[PDB]
Amino acid sequence: AIAHIATEYVFSDFLLKDPPESKYKGLRLELAVDKLVSCIAVGLPLLLISLAFAQEITLGSQISCFAPTSFSWRQAAYVDSFCWAAVQQKVPLWLHKFFPYILLLVAVLLYLPNLFWRFTAAPHLSSDLKFVMEELDKCYNRDIKDIKPIVEQYLKTKNNSYGLIIKYLICRVVTLIIVFTACIYLGYYISLFSLTDEFTCNIRTGILRNDTALPPLVQCKLIAVGVFRLLSYINLIIYVLIMPFIIYAMLVPFRKTANVLKVYEVLPTFSTYDDHSLFLLFLEENVSELKSYKFLKVLENIKNTGENFDTIQYLTSLGTVK
Amino acid sequence: AIAHIATEYVFSDFLLKDPPESKYKGLRLELAVDKLVSCIAVGLPLLLISLAFAQEITLGSQISCFAPTSFSWRQAAYVDSFCWAAVQQKVPLWLHKFFPYILLLVAVLLYLPNLFWRFTAAPHLSSDLKFVMEELDKCYNRDIKDIKPIVEQYLKTKNNSYGLIIKYLICRVVTLIIVFTACIYLGYYISLFSLTDEFTCNIRTGILRNDTALPPLVQCKLIAVGVFRLLSYINLIIYVLIMPFIIYAMLVPFRKTANVLKVYEVLPTFSTYDDHSLFLLFLEENVSELKSYKFLKVLENIKNTGENFDTIQYLTSLGTVK
Amino acid sequence: AIAHIATEYVFSDFLLKDPPESKYKGLRLELAVDKLVSCIAVGLPLLLISLAFAQEITLGSQISCFAPTSFSWRQAAYVDSFCWAAVQQKVPLWLHKFFPYILLLVAVLLYLPNLFWRFTAAPHLSSDLKFVMEELDKCYNRDIKDIKPIVEQYLKTKNNSYGLIIKYLICRVVTLIIVFTACIYLGYYISLFSLTDEFTCNIRTGILRNDTALPPLVQCKLIAVGVFRLLSYINLIIYVLIMPFIIYAMLVPFRKTANVLKVYEVLPTFSTYDDHSLFLLFLEENVSELKSYKFLKVLENIKNTGENFDTIQYLTSLGTVK
Amino acid sequence: AIAHIATEYVFSDFLLKDPPESKYKGLRLELAVDKLVSCIAVGLPLLLISLAFAQEITLGSQISCFAPTSFSWRQAAYVDSFCWAAVQQKVPLWLHKFFPYILLLVAVLLYLPNLFWRFTAAPHLSSDLKFVMEELDKCYNRDIKDIKPIVEQYLKTKNNSYGLIIKYLICRVVTLIIVFTACIYLGYYISLFSLTDEFTCNIRTGILRNDTALPPLVQCKLIAVGVFRLLSYINLIIYVLIMPFIIYAMLVPFRKTANVLKVYEVLPTFSTYDDHSLFLLFLEENVSELKSYKFLKVLENIKNTGENFDTIQYLTSLGTVK
Amino acid sequence: AIAHIATEYVFSDFLLKDPPESKYKGLRLELAVDKLVSCIAVGLPLLLISLAFAQEITLGSQISCFAPTSFSWRQAAYVDSFCWAAVQQKVPLWLHKFFPYILLLVAVLLYLPNLFWRFTAAPHLSSDLKFVMEELDKCYNRDIKDIKPIVEQYLKTKNNSYGLIIKYLICRVVTLIIVFTACIYLGYYISLFSLTDEFTCNIRTGILRNDTALPPLVQCKLIAVGVFRLLSYINLIIYVLIMPFIIYAMLVPFRKTANVLKVYEVLPTFSTYDDHSLFLLFLEENVSELKSYKFLKVLENIKNTGENFDTIQYLTSLGTVK
Amino acid sequence: AIAHIATEYVFSDFLLKDPPESKYKGLRLELAVDKLVSCIAVGLPLLLISLAFAQEITLGSQISCFAPTSFSWRQAAYVDSFCWAAVQQKVPLWLHKFFPYILLLVAVLLYLPNLFWRFTAAPHLSSDLKFVMEELDKCYNRDIKDIKPIVEQYLKTKNNSYGLIIKYLICRVVTLIIVFTACIYLGYYISLFSLTDEFTCNIRTGILRNDTALPPLVQCKLIAVGVFRLLSYINLIIYVLIMPFIIYAMLVPFRKTANVLKVYEVLPTFSTYDDHSLFLLFLEENVSELKSYKFLKVLENIKNTGENFDTIQYLTSLGTVK
């Protein structure tokens, strides 16, 4: 065990030589901020429920009941199981019983909208981005060859569209609503479980109801109430912290967006709650793959300083990219 | 078990024929010292919490309580679970209970800034480095062909920038602050757990509060206090040791940096708290992939001794690299 | 279980058809003797700690205490856990408790210098070796074409360098110092645990200190003392055996080194505590990949006997290698 | 469990469609007989120690002690652990305790010389074999082209060498010595454990030495003595059986070796305790990869019968191989 | 568990889309009947020993002893372990104890001859088959080109050889002898374990031999005798069923063998206890890879009916295959 | 556990993005209906035996015996094991004990004929199909080139063959017979285990036969009788449902088969209990890979409607396929 830990945490590469995106393929169909927010909101409750029942913090059973001394092992086990079964039908008790279930439901609900976006919006956007990038590269190549209209019109038509931005807005709204509901539930659970974690189960039911040997009531203690409360507090803190990030995410009109086509306007061939703005944002987020755009952006940065050099010679110096 | 250990530690290659970076691909977006410091600071608490609960050092339960002889097995188990549940609500007790949780939180907080840098700074820097390297290679090739301006201007514009160095500084500051907070917490825990590790839990709560058979107090012993203290001391020592490395890491103006472009100044075509200095440092750290730079550095090393040989013949001797 | 053992040790290939380095790629940045010594020194303590706690040799718990007959199961378990917790705070007792931890620390400390060398010396040496090999191949090709200066000067500049040999020396010194410290610790542990392995724990602490029913002292036995002593003896023997190998490893000036360039001196184009000696040693250790060197070494071996044949015809017979 | 066994032993391919060496790559640096002998000698003790502790044959603990009826569970467990700890310090007892350790040591010692040969002799021999094969192929190609000296001289120089054969001899001698020592140890263990497997442990040591309630002696039984004896007998039988194979392996001068170059003597261009004999043996063992040698061997087999056909036409019929 | 079973037996492909030999590579060095017989004979005892100790059929321990009521848990466990240890030294008892060991030995012995054949006969036969196939393809290609001696002579020399057929015969004889010995052992075990499975162990040995409290004899029951008997009966039935298949396998002279070269005799260029017969059998078993042979066999099948068409036009119609 | 279930059933792709036959390679040597029937008949008993012993439905042991109160734990365990051992030698009892074994035997017997067909019929049929497809493609290509006999004759010879259809019939008959036998056995087991599942074991055998303290008889209950009965009923229902599918499978003469060659009859070059019918069925089942057949089938579908267009222009429009 010790040697296995040593091999897997010291001798094996952990954060040194593991390449996350070595020669990343495909296209980036999700924004970085949105991806980070979704990953946090999905993987936080899973990590918390994994931590809540780790063997390092759990001592015995979920509940512990004080059976009378006259009871044998099997009678005391029956008492424990009976009180655990009645902890559901009896509000705090069933909430403590199903806390991992509720956190799992929250995680699944938070994962749902991103899956919906990936299954009903990713392919069309990916195809559009690929077409736009390939047409921009072809236009740059032909212009470079000449110096030694389709994309502008297509973006103009996309300007009069709202489907993509509407779907983005409903995804953000669903995520925000689910996070807010989770925050409310966590606050309610924290409020309702700061009183105590001891409950009396009644085992005089059925054919042994009239028996006098059994105690009228059996006291039982919830074991993981404190850990659950601490983890719920942590989850609420994290969700409150990530709350403004969703607001910033769906704040499209006021976002600090720089148009990619500005650098392309140098080429002579080239001449706010909308699909065009969202498509421009996705282009900018996915513009790292383009290489001609790198040349145009370098030229723009050079000319931004104020150097008095003609751009015609620089454009003629460059050749075909690919 | 014995034969499995033999196979996995003797007959299987352990440190002999395992290639770490055989034909390493991609680009090195992190400095070696920064990568080592981050890896140590992240993987030390994880290794320590893995060691703290290894079966080789843990004998029984987290706590051990001395129940009265009249108590049965189930009553004593209830006593143990009750005292373990009250160890939270009761400062040292809950700290001992949640020591692995606190170390995990420290590890996650230390891992966060590197993930932020990798998600919001890696792609732009990687693209810039690739562009600079390819332009340097093309310039070397064309100059070699001729003997038989863009990169200099771009670096001049980058000289008037501060975003990358600012992000680097905030990453280093966050890492240093988290390490300092962890050091303070570990020192506090060491100070507060050198007194004793025995506490009395009171089990006369609820419907059995008025019962006289139960003892008024039950003594319980924390088992892993010594191991926790030793591991916390080791963690504090390691963090204190790695403290000056972060200071040396964010000490950019006074770093011993050699400009790569000096060797390129031989080519006739080519002619301190800043983005340019950080970019030069990243170029130098990632210059091993360039092959023309190897020729230029070899020529520079040859001429550094003081040999009286013309460089024109040496430059004409070399040809296209790739 | 039996059939699984049969499949994994008889029907599956174990030492017959498992290729260790079939078409080995990359470069050999570590010497064979150094690699073997480091692998032994790292994987011996890990194997020993894995063997110490194997289920084939461990019967029960780490310690065994003789509780009074009047004690119940839970009271005796509390006694065991209490004496195991006091075995730390009480020198032999905590050493027996933390023997696997100390061996793991020794293994990690021994693994550290090789990781430091691999992270701060491997890339530069690999690039230098690749450049030297490619230039030697190109020189051989052009000389063969002609018959039908850079490398010599670069080695001359490297002659006036000491960084690589200094780093090699500090790595060897760190390894030797750590091995010597481990030897001293193992000898001390063997000396201090040949007396006995029985200790008395006092459980009359706390609210039960004044109770008269509990025994004044409880005798306890360490179970794995003999296995620990035997494994420590084996580790000390192995470290003593590998002690002279490190001395031979850092003995660079007196090493039996044959210069690779001697065979290359046949080509007309070609004409002791130092970087040049270490680089020549690494070239010789990594010369198996070169194919022109194979031809030159074959010619040298042919001419070593004393055959009276002109080398010009043999050189003209060979052609381009690659 | 039943269905898993069915899937892994019936529906999954076991010996039908598992290709051992489908398109085998690299070179065969070890002889078939030597590889088989080493594999047997290494994997037999591992298989035996795996079988010795399989759950199909082990009932309870390593030892079983008859504690008095007045003892509780914990006192009897302490008795068992104490007698198991004293089984070491007390010759047969510690041998029974450490039998798996001794067999593992034997396996590791037997694996060591082959690793030494692979790390200090494989690369040079592989390079020499590759060079010889490529030169033979080139000579065959040029001779075939002509009909429409280096290798002979190199083998002549290798004739006056002894390093490779010396290393082979020391490897064989080390293997034989280790196998003989293992045989002697196994015979001794069989002789010393045919008497009985019952021993008395004395638990009246320490603060309970003067107590009269404890028995003066406690009888204990070793459980796996018979299985250990049977497995040791099997191991001794196998080692005795493989004893003459090592003698035949290092018997180089008297080995039935056919020279490969005899078939190559047909080409007009081509014209006993030694390195040359060992190299010829390795060539013959690794000659299956050569394709021109296949043509030459086919021609030799055709001419061995006594057919009166000129070889010039057959040689001219064949063309370039590769 | 239920959902895992569903995923691995319903939703995952089991016998629908798992390709056994999709684009099979290499050569078939073993006959289909021989491969099937060896696979059955090897994997039947392994499957049987896996089934014998499955948790679905094993209730408790290997043996069950009726200790007196006055004995405690530890004394009864000692009794069980003692009787299990004496079940070896006491013929039926040790046979029941080591039945899985004997079946494993049988499986290993049956696997040995096929490994010997694969390690000392596969490479030469594979090389010969590859050479013959490539020469046949080349001859077909050149004959097709012409229409628009080596292989026949080589087969004639192989006609006067017996090494391959001798090795095949010794492999078949070893397999048959081992199967017959296993059948005899299984019949003996079935005969000797149909009487009863109850034995008395005597625990009055050693220092407690003179004690009167212990019973003079302790009755014990073997639990898995019936399962072992049923599995041994199944194994014997299967081995008896596969007995004639080995006889048919080594029956080479009387085998229904069709010569491959008969179809090749159409080409004008082409003109019983033996190596030639075995090589022809291996060619026929491995002829599926050849494509020219497919054309020749199609032509032979066409002409077998009795169609009066000239073969010259059909031969000229076909072209180069590869 | 909860988070692992979430990851493996929600976040990981389950039925969304798992490609079953993405770019399927090789040839389809088994019919779809036959493959489905064989997969069902093989994987149903395995799934059922996996479900029968799942931890979600099994409470305790296989059998439960009511030992007297005076018996200790070990005596009661001996009673349980003894009655479980006598449940075999005593018809219903051993059937309940070996139900998983019988279902495994049924599964293996059902898997056997498909393995026999795959090992003795797949390669020849695959080679024949590949030859036929390649010849059809070549004929289509040459006919297309011309417009700008071997296959017909080969099919005529195959018309006078019966080996393949005979092997198919024996495979179907073996499968049907095994399924019918399994149905009969399951019906018998259902009939014989609807009475009760309680049996009395007699433990007064051996040296304790004359002892009066032991009860004359001990009642024991089979636990999994109901689950076994339900699963056997399900298996019988499924086998009855799949019974007519085998009859439809071996019903070759009356199968709705469309000849592939009909569409090829358009090309001018081209001109019931049998091998030819089975080969045509396999061609049709494996015709999806052919691309020229797609063109011919499209033309046939176009002309089936009744359009009055000449086919010569359509044939000349198409070109070479591959």
Side-chain angles (χ1 to χ4, degrees), chain E residues 19-269:
Chain E
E21 269 179 348
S22 49
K23 297 176 180 178
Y24 177 72
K25 295 176 180 178
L27 282 199
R28 294 191 271 310
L29 273 310
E30 311 96 20
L31 301 101
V33 47
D34 287 7
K35 190 152 59 106
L36 281 186
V37 156
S38 165
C39 163
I40 287 174
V42 163
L44 184 86
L46 300 185
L47 178 93
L48 289 203
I49 62 181
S50 306
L51 292 188
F53 292 89
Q55 313 274 0
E56 285 100 338
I57 212 161
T58 69
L59 185 45
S61 280
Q62 283 99 352
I63 64 147
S64 276
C65 299
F66 197 70
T69 324
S70 42
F71 276 18
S72 37
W73 182 292
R74 293 303 276 238
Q75 307 181 276
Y78 168 86
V79 161
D80 250 341
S81 287
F82 186 96
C83 310
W84 179 247
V87 85
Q88 163 154 350
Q89 91 204 65
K90 299 177 78 280
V91 41
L93 270 63
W94 95 284
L95 282 191
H96 170 261
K97 170 144 182 203
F98 291 102
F99 187 75
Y101 279 22
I102 303 171
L103 257 65
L104 176 54
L105 169 70
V106 165
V108 165
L109 288 191
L110 272 169
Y111 175 81
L112 207 61
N114 97 80
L115 187 68
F116 149 76
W117 164 275
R118 136 162 171 235
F119 261 91
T120 89
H124 175 265
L125 189 59
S126 178
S127 89
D128 190 339
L129 283 176
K130 193 164 311 272
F131 166 81
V132 159
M133 271 145 68
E134 82 145 349
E135 291 310 312
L136 273 172
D137 259 339
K138 264 152 41 163
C139 173
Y140 171 84
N141 265 260
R142 54 176 291 270
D143 196 9
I144 284 300
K145 139 164 300 182
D146 290 356
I147 309 185
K148 300 178 180 180
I150 39 181
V151 298
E152 302 103 291
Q153 291 168 0
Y154 178 66
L155 270 38
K156 289 317 286 175
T157 88
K158 197 190 307 298
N159 195 316
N160 277 344
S161 302
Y162 293 93
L164 202 74
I165 189 90
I166 276 286
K167 260 154 102 204
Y168 191 73
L169 283 185
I170 89 175
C171 274
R172 288 306 144 276
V173 159
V174 155
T175 290
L176 172 66
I177 276 178
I178 294 181
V179 168
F180 195 70
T181 300
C183 283
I184 298 294
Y185 153 72
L186 290 167
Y188 179 46
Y189 178 96
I190 290 179
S191 300
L192 70 93
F193 251 121
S194 293
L195 46 101
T196 178
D197 57 342
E198 303 205 40
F199 81 99
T200 74
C201 80
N202 173 40
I203 72 167
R204 299 258 295 282
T205 85
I207 81 170
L208 50 143
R209 142 192 319 286
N210 291 326
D211 171 351
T212 70
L214 300 117
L217 291 172
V218 162
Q219 170 134 290
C220 304
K221 178 99 152 108
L222 295 314
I223 304 309
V225 154
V227 180
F228 285 173
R229 205 211 310 102
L230 177 76
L231 291 183
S232 66
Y233 184 50
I234 286 181
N235 202 103
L236 173 69
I237 286 185
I238 296 301
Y239 277 3
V240 152
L241 272 200
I242 73 159
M243 210 58 99
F245 277 86
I246 298 160
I247 309 299
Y248 170 78
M250 92 259 277
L251 175 125
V252 193
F254 218 72
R255 210 100 53 92
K256 292 179 180 179
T257 313
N259 296 3
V260 157
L261 321 176
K262 308 291 202 132
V263 304
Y264 271 95
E265 286 182 351
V266 161
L267 285 202
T269 38

Side-chain angles (χ1 to χ4, degrees), chain C residues 1-11 13-17 19-20 22-23 28 32 35-36 47 51-61 64-69 71-73 76-77 80 197-198 200 217-223 225-227 229-231 288 294-295 298 301-303 305 307 309 314 317-318, chain D residues 8-9 14-15 20-21 25-26 30 35-36 38-39 42-43 46-47 49-51 53-56 61-63 70-75 77-82 84-86 88-89 94 97-98 100-101 104 111 114-115 118-120 123-124 127-128 131 134-135 138 149-150 153-154 156-157 160 203 205-208 214:
Chain C
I2 297 268
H4 273 316
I5 288 156
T7 57
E8 103 188 319
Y9 286 121
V10 176
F11 311 103
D13 293 339
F14 200 23
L15 301 94
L16 296 174
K17 300 182 170 195
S22 49
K23 297 176 180 178
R28 294 191 271 310
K35 190 152 58 106
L36 281 186
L47 178 93
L51 292 188
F53 292 89
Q55 313 274 0
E56 285 100 338
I57 212 161
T58 69
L59 185 45
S61 280
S64 276
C65 299
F66 197 70
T69 323
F71 276 18
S72 37
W73 182 292
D80 250 341
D197 57 342
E198 303 205 40
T200 74
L217 291 172
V218 162
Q219 170 134 290
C220 304
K221 178 99 152 108
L222 295 314
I223 304 309
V225 154
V227 179
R229 204 211 310 102
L230 177 76
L231 291 183
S288 85
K294 187 53 184 174
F295 290 123
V298 161
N301 280 339
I302 289 184
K303 299 313 168 187
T305 49
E307 292 180 350
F309 294 98
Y314 284 154
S317 62
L318 324 166
Chain D
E8 103 188 319
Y9 286 121
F14 200 23
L15 301 94
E21 268 179 348
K25 295 176 180 178
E30 311 96 20
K35 190 152 58 106
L36 281 186
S38 165
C39 163
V42 163
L46 300 185
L47 178 93
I49 62 181
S50 306
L51 292 188
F53 292 90
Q55 313 274 0
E56 285 100 338
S61 280
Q62 283 99 352
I63 64 147
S70 42
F71 276 18
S72 37
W73 182 292
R74 293 303 276 238
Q75 307 181 276
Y78 169 86
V79 161
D80 250 341
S81 287
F82 186 96
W84 178 247
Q88 163 154 350
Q89 91 204 65
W94 95 284
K97 170 144 182 203
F98 291 102
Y101 279 22
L104 176 54
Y111 175 80
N114 97 80
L115 187 68
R118 136 162 171 235
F119 261 91
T120 89
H124 175 265
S127 89
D128 190 339
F131 166 81
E134 82 145 349
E135 291 310 312
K138 264 152 41 163
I150 39 181
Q153 291 168 0
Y154 178 66
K156 289 317 286 175
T157 88
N160 277 344
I203 72 167
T205 85
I207 81 170
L208 50 143
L214 300 117

Side-chain angles (χ1 to χ4, degrees), chain D residues 52-297:
Chain D
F53 292 90
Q55 313 274 0
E56 285 100 338
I57 212 161
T58 69
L59 185 45
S61 280
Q62 283 99 352
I63 64 147
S64 276
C65 299
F66 197 70
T69 324
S70 42
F71 276 18
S72 37
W73 182 292
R74 293 303 276 238
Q75 307 181 276
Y78 169 86
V79 161
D80 250 341
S81 287
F82 186 96
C83 310
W84 178 247
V87 85
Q88 163 154 350
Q89 91 204 65
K90 299 177 78 280
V91 41
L93 271 63
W94 95 284
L95 282 191
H96 170 261
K97 170 144 182 203
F98 291 102
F99 187 75
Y101 279 22
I102 303 171
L103 257 65
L104 176 54
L105 169 70
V106 165
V108 165
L109 288 191
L110 272 169
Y111 175 80
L112 207 61
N114 97 80
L115 187 68
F116 149 76
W117 164 275
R118 136 162 171 235
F119 261 91
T120 89
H124 175 265
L125 189 59
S126 178
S127 89
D128 190 339
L129 283 176
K130 193 164 311 272
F131 166 81
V132 159
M133 271 145 68
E134 82 145 349
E135 291 310 312
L136 273 172
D137 259 339
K138 264 152 41 163
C139 173
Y140 171 84
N141 265 260
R142 54 176 291 270
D143 196 9
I144 284 300
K145 139 165 300 182
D146 290 356
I147 309 185
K148 300 178 180 180
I150 39 181
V151 298
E152 302 103 290
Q153 291 168 0
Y154 178 66
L155 270 38
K156 289 317 286 175
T157 88
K158 197 190 307 298
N159 195 316
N160 277 344
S161 302
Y162 293 93
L164 202 74
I165 188 90
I166 276 286
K167 260 154 102 204
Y168 191 73
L169 283 185
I170 89 175
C171 274
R172 288 306 144 276
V173 159
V174 155
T175 290
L176 172 66
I177 276 178
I178 294 181
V179 168
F180 195 70
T181 300
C183 283
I184 298 294
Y185 153 72
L186 290 167
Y188 179 46
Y189 178 95
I190 290 179
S191 300
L192 70 93
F193 251 121
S194 293
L195 46 101
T196 178
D197 57 342
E198 303 205 40
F199 81 99
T200 74
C201 80
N202 173 40
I203 72 167
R204 298 258 295 282
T205 85
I207 81 170
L208 50 143
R209 142 192 319 286
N210 291 326
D211 171 351
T212 70
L214 300 117
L217 291 172
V218 162
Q219 170 134 290
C220 304
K221 178 99 152 108
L222 295 314
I223 304 309
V225 154
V227 179
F228 285 173
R229 204 211 310 102
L230 177 76
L231 291 183
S232 66
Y233 184 50
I234 286 181
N235 202 103
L236 173 69
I237 286 185
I238 295 301
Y239 277 3
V240 152
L241 272 200
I242 73 159
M243 210 58 99
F245 277 86
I246 298 160
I247 309 299
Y248 170 78
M250 92 259 277
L251 175 125
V252 193
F254 218 72
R255 210 100 53 92
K256 292 179 180 179
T257 312
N259 296 3
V260 157
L261 321 176
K262 308 291 202 132
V263 304
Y264 271 95
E265 286 182 351
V266 161
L267 285 202
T269 38
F270 221 95
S271 150
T272 61
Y273 184 60
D274 210 20
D275 207 325
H276 175 78
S277 175
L278 192 66
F279 188 76
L280 275 203
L281 271 161
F282 273 80
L283 270 173
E284 162 57 11
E285 186 263 317
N286 202 181
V287 85
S288 85
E289 194 175 5
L290 270 191
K291 320 103 171 173
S292 57
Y293 167 86
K294 187 53 184 174
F295 290 123
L296 268 308
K297 194 71 187 66

Side-chain angles (χ1 to χ4, degrees), chain C residues 26-228:
Chain C
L27 282 199
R28 294 191 271 310
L29 273 310
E30 311 96 20
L31 301 101
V33 47
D34 287 6
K35 190 152 58 106
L36 281 186
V37 156
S38 165
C39 163
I40 287 174
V42 163
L44 184 86
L46 300 185
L47 178 93
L48 289 203
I49 62 181
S50 306
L51 292 188
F53 292 89
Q55 313 274 0
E56 285 100 338
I57 212 161
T58 69
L59 185 45
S61 280
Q62 283 99 351
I63 64 147
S64 276
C65 299
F66 197 70
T69 323
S70 42
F71 276 18
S72 37
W73 182 292
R74 293 303 276 238
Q75 307 181 276
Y78 168 86
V79 161
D80 250 341
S81 287
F82 186 96
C83 310
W84 178 247
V87 85
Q88 163 154 350
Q89 91 204 65
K90 299 177 78 280
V91 41
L93 270 63
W94 95 284
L95 282 191
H96 170 261
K97 170 144 182 203
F98 291 102
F99 187 75
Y101 279 22
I102 303 171
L103 258 65
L104 176 54
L105 169 70
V106 165
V108 165
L109 288 191
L110 272 169
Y111 175 80
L112 207 61
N114 97 80
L115 187 68
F116 149 76
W117 164 275
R118 136 162 171 235
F119 261 91
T120 89
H124 175 265
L125 189 59
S126 178
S127 89
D128 190 339
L129 283 176
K130 193 164 311 272
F131 166 81
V132 159
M133 271 145 68
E134 82 145 349
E135 291 310 312
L136 273 172
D137 259 339
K138 264 152 41 163
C139 173
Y140 171 84
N141 265 260
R142 54 176 291 270
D143 196 9
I144 284 300
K145 139 165 300 181
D146 290 356
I147 309 185
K148 300 178 180 180
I150 39 181
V151 298
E152 302 103 291
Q153 291 168 0
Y154 178 66
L155 270 38
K156 289 317 286 175
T157 88
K158 197 190 307 298
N159 195 316
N160 277 344
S161 302
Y162 293 93
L164 202 74
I165 188 90
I166 276 286
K167 260 154 102 204
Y168 191 73
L169 283 185
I170 89 175
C171 274
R172 288 306 144 276
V173 159
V174 155
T175 290
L176 172 66
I177 276 178
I178 294 181
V179 168
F180 195 70
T181 300
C183 283
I184 298 294
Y185 153 72
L186 290 167
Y188 179 46
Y189 178 95
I190 290 179
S191 300
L192 70 93
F193 251 121
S194 293
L195 46 101
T196 178
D197 57 342
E198 303 205 40
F199 81 99
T200 74
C201 80
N202 173 39
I203 72 167
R204 299 258 295 282
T205 85
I207 81 170
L208 50 143
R209 142 192 319 286
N210 291 326
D211 171 350
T212 70
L214 300 118
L217 291 172
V218 162
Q219 170 134 290
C220 304
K221 178 99 152 108
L222 295 314
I223 304 309
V225 154
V227 179
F228 285 173

